Design a protein around this ligand. Structure first.
Ligand SMILES: [Cl-]
Ligand SMILES: [Cl-]
Ligand SMILES: [Cl-]
Ligand SMILES: [Cl-]
Ligand SMILES: [Cl-]
Ligand SMILES: [Cl-]
Lengths: 363, 363, 363, 363
């Protein structure tokens, strides 16, 4: 990885702020002959914000709806007293002025959420490739908003059965909260409304599952699958934590119960595991089981409220309430988490298949 | 990053298993003229396991105790019925046979903990550079073992004061548990003994703090500081999760309280933050505040107990108890977490200082 | 480097064919605060082909004519019986069908010269940075066209004095041939006309000089300055060779005469060399002397003539004369060679200055 | 590429000077299950200098003579009035003091030829893989020493027949000159002896051929096959130029004669080319034809003669004759050129085969 480039063999270099001309990316290394038009890319992008404004336009790498193998440029055109007096608390205004000596006049620029358009646009190509590869299914959903949280205990049979069956269509059918639990979601809609009248913001947690992942993906010792996934998710805006499998709470379970015993699958074709506390990754390598992980998103710093903060000139004052912002943007990161997971998987799949070729010729 | 290479400008490529000849690494990009002998590298390595067996030997890149700027090779010499009948549950035996078609005859090989010698050896060079840079202090400690956990609430004043003052000497003075809390540590020594007689294993959580980190470190949008740190920690053996700042529990705090207001430091030289819920990183860039994070380590799969597992031939059987293993290896990852954090920081510091030069000439 | 990405710290990822929507690049790692508009980028682009068709449009990374430090997207909009019967001899038609299984319907696509727009657009930013850095001057010119060649003997005093004084304005004042030698150029215009009536094509050689290059640039052992420059030039379309300094002909000179003795500069500030047979690079590191090199460009495969070739179906036939092409496109590569040299230099300069910082703190 | 790391998927990170403890490398990404012991690696290393001193010792990545897929460490142990008064002319003494502020006390250190041990050790693994892949044959030989040069005209039928048949065994049977031409070699042995009595040094040119290279290798637009090969060869010590195919002299041939027509092979299985002026690469992609290239090596700077040079203190003086050095070291670079070519090819082969998998699933 390097700066605004993600991936090794399937690479995506992104660009763009909010108050510039356009935002997009360049996907390098896509396999040739893949059916690819803007219809394969808009649905995930059109899931980012729920005229059609944010519309992609493929710039290269395709001909007659099929990829050539050359870089694929994609873009969404940019429609776009207190400013620069205080750095907004818990925003990247001050760190940008320290690192770059200059920030965007407003809106935060590159640190904001508009940059993720390149992520989602590239992840749509990766998603289609993984479906052709092994029918990989990547579904994310909101499992927690503030104190209201799903029962995502990895040992709970009901939660594990949800991870095995949850689809992207079901997540979006429950409304904008994108929580598949009806009881928890109703508790969620009451807490986002409470923070809405309070002119506040609240954080959340996104849980995502990867099904039918090919075995053998991951590049120890540093580019392990769960390490590249953590790298991918923790690079998202406002993310504060990442865990997979049994996660943090699994450390309380002894090895006699935490260990995943092996068994030959009931369909009788492969060795599977009885339990999936490992989260589908063992020694940094996928074993074909379900890969599930949760990502913590902090509460939005931009609150519709007054704050006592010091200026850049560093004098104590009151940052006036801007007063126009939604209190829970965590469900808007569900497609970005899905897109980020697909980029990692297709990169590890191509690297591993290169080893599978070499393993076949030196044998 | 790529496979067994970590870093961009300060790069370390590692190698080595347990049952091979040697284990070590090659550090590429170290600044010339740094006082460097094996005495700068052994202490952290000699903290990995608590004749002197694991002794490093610098192979190149130095002359008269000073670095030349060329690659620095370093090594520790390798002193080293049921085997290959079953893949050990929750171990990397099966995934290695699927990805590579072959595993080490025993001991797990590259997936085990011996590979981390290259990490610690390289991290010792990075640690010394960061001390010369801005007197950076990297201290890690065990904050949780199973159900026994420290009160690491990021809003707790006492815990924040511990992160501001805890030293590596104090962590090792409390014994092998490496928990600075005397009440919690005594509860820890009773739970590791309980799992010891039970012939079981238990997981834990390592908390680490970075002090005096230079402002401006981190490379958005993908190589953000907290993203490279998560990548670094989640690539370690047995790690199941990573969080920094307010982490997962911070998502329950509204923005009005979670936001970190700014203020001019009491020593009067810089703009600081009143609270540090951001964890010293904002928009993927360090702001000079304390960087604290916790890493979850699963319970060891190698238990001194019997397990019901299926063979590679995939027939149900009993994996006999090996019966010789310690039930809590989490405190052995404290120096590896410290070494992993130093490698990330020195890489981001060199990249950022290259931008600081360019910022000074185009101005 | 990786596929369509060039550079380490100053990175450029390009994209685009001829028959697609647009062609351009993403420049990652540009220092913030640099005065940058399309006026800094069009002149070199407007030198590629000598309404204004090929006009760049900055997409991001700038605000109020200054760079922010974020990625900089740039683009030129694409205005754009025998086809697919034969692969055109010495073209990339057949290799594309073998590697990708598909080629562009016509025009060669990514293998053609339109891809170099991203190179030139990015090289313009690198050129301006190197001018602010140490007043670096990069001038290229045509020194050979077929059998007509300049007397570019590196030991010739007149040729060395030309390399020390030749400017980009003087190269373009002599006409489209871009050969600074008036006698040789008149011999050149007579040989391109001879091959024009013959409906043929002819190759050439481009010589380029870099002046005021900062000392210390280059990353041994693989990313040496002359190695990155060779990599940069040999990646251009139709290039068949690269040499620098004394080059191939210098191998005939014994070390007693080929060696460059040192001497303290006449301006009295630095140690210089009496002769420059090394070409300004020694051990892969720039010494501040003039860096001069020549690049061989083959004769264009697309000739306005008939050729006997086998089909994809592989039957002997006659490829009809297309009859519309210029016989000498070597002078059109002068700005691309300049742009390619600037990209290498600014990358090595930023890496080296990162080491100069580290050298200053560990001292 | 990065500093002392070469390759993308098949990566080699080298280390080591002359006056250090050891020299070697770490090969990352080797396919598992390859028969590999020191006997596969010593022959090319034992061809570098023609007790057994320079003996490799595999440190990791193998078990029972087969590779595991983990990094492979390899090493050769280091047996090792005028010094530091003058920087030796045309040596890297001065540039090292400017870039690093320090050089090795003597011998040049990392800039010398001892670093190439890691290249040859890694190239031996790549060579064996390419033989299993498509029976790739890499043979290099000395074609020129000073003014004495072979008739390596690419259009000459006899020279092309030599490239098609020359073997590594035949090159070493003619003696240490490693020139397959008996008439030219006898003219070579007379010119190296002339410069030997003169206490001088002379340069040379190494020509290398790659046979049976798989079609489709090369990663446009920057990592084209001939670009990675030029990068690989120009990173070698003392190299001053690189050309492939028709090279520089081919620019004098019009396209009507320079173009390579296609034809279906006489063995009747594939489309081949009648002539090979392209050098087996077209558009940066291998077409399966012979890949031949020449590399220019300058005359050794270390001459057994007196030189007038300025000090580091920069006062005119006489550098005394060291008087112990061989006048023609170009034949010692034949195995290094072969090893360097194998590293490039196996990297491009693995990347391309990853695309061949992706091409097979999206189809
Ligand atoms: Cl890269
Ligand atoms: Cl947006
Ligand atoms: Cl790399
Ligand atoms: Cl160990
Ligand atoms: Cl064009
Ligand atoms: Cl040697």
């Amino acid at each position: 990885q390097g700066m605004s480039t993600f991936g090794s063999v399937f690479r995506v270099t992104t660009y763009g702020e909010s108050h510039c001309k356009s935002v997009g990316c360049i996907v390098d290394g896509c396999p040739p002959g893949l059916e690819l038009t803007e219809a394969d890319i808009q649905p995930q992008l059109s899931r980012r914000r729920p005229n059609e404004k944010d519309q992609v336009q493929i710039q290269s790498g395709t001909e007659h709806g099929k990829t050539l193998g050359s870089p694929i440029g994609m873009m969404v055109m940019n429609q776009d007293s207190e400013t620069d007096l205080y750095p907004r608390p818990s925003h990247a205004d001050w760190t940008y002025m320290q690192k770059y000596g200059v920030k965007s006049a407003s809106g935060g620029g590159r640190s904001s959420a508009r940059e993720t358009i390149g992520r989602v646009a590239a992840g749509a190509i990766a998603e289609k490739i993984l479906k052709k590869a092994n029918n990989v299914e990547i579904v994310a959903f909101v499992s927690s908003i503030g104190e209201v949280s799903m029962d995502r205990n990895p040992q709970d049979a009901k939660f594990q059965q949800l991870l095995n069956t949850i689809t992207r269509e079901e997540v979006d059918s429950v409304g904008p909260i994108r929580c598949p639990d009806p009881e928890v979601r109703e508790q969620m809609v009451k807490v986002i409304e409470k923070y809405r009248d309070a002119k506040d913001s609240i954080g959340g947690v996104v849980t995502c599952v990867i099904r039918n992942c090919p075995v053998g993906l991951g590049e120890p010792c540093f580019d392990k699958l769960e390490a590249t996934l953590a790298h991918a998710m923790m690079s998202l805006p406002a993310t504060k934590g990442f865990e997979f499998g049994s996660g943090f709470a699994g450390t309380r379970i002894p090895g006699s119960k935490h260990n995943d015993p092996f068994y030959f699958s009931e369909e009788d074709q492969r060795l599977r595991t009885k339990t999936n506390n490992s989260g589908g990754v063992q020694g940094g390598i996928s074993n074909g089981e379900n890969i599930y992980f949760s990502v913590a998103f902090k509460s939005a710093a931009t609150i519709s409220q007054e704050q006592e903060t010091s200026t850049y000139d560093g004098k104590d004052g009151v940052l006036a309430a801007r007063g126009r912002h939604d209190p829970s943007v965590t469900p808007r990161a569900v497609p970005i988490v899905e897109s980020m997971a697909a980029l990692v998987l297709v990169d590890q799949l191509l690297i591993q298949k290169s080893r599978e070729y070499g393993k076949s010729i030196v044998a």
